[PDB]
Amino acid sequence: PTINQLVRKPRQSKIKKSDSPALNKGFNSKKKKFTDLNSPQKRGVCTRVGTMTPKKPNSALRKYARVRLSNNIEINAYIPGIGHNLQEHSVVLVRGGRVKDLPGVRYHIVRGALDTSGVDGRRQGRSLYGTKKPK
Template sequence: MYFHLRNRLKQKPFIKTRVFNKLSLAPHRKGLVLRVVIITPKKPNSALRHVAKVTIYKNIKRIFGRIPGIGYLPVKFNRVLVRGGRANDLPSVRLTLVRNIYDFSPLSMRKRRRSIYGVSRPSGFTKHKRRRYRHLHM
């Protein structure tokens, strides 16, 4: 009986490896791009997805981050901001890069989902005119 308990106490506690552990318990972290890679997704999907290998400044861990949007890709030694958000069909990709912060440029001419791609609101752009007040917007 005691032998069983002694072995149980010797075992290390099981800790899940989560995204927050990689970002050292923060919502965002600054990182440095080491290289940009093109990966193909898992079985039912087919595409060419851009992924960047990033070193996190704080804990010096190297992880893969998804590059959202079409267009400009970060170059080697660019500074980027990394947040959580995994790509379901890409194995080992659990983080996403944030656009329009540090050296990672925004997408131009985006009207919808601007906050994700780092685009500021264009001048004179109203998202939705309420039906009740539409006679006021001429």
């Protein structure tokens, strides 16, 4: 554009959309609103735990968990690891991060935070998947 129609209509930027849009909304219960405070984690109670199959050339069945968080919104959340302890009504700490080759789930679960316990036998990549030092 020329210099006059760029003074008269300035350079508006291109907005950046944040992934994990459920972790950056709070819920004031005394006013029933949605605040914005950019939380790194947010805990929640679980609703359904089943298995979901990938849609890629991959072929498996992945363990997800439908969790409603501190704010009253529903997500789907993946469980990393081997074994879990996630029947229903358990309190788990939702970690951000998308898992691809799975539709409609883009969050993890911190393995070992509130009520989920760590994996049964890892000793290699041990800090994530959350188990303590053996012996």
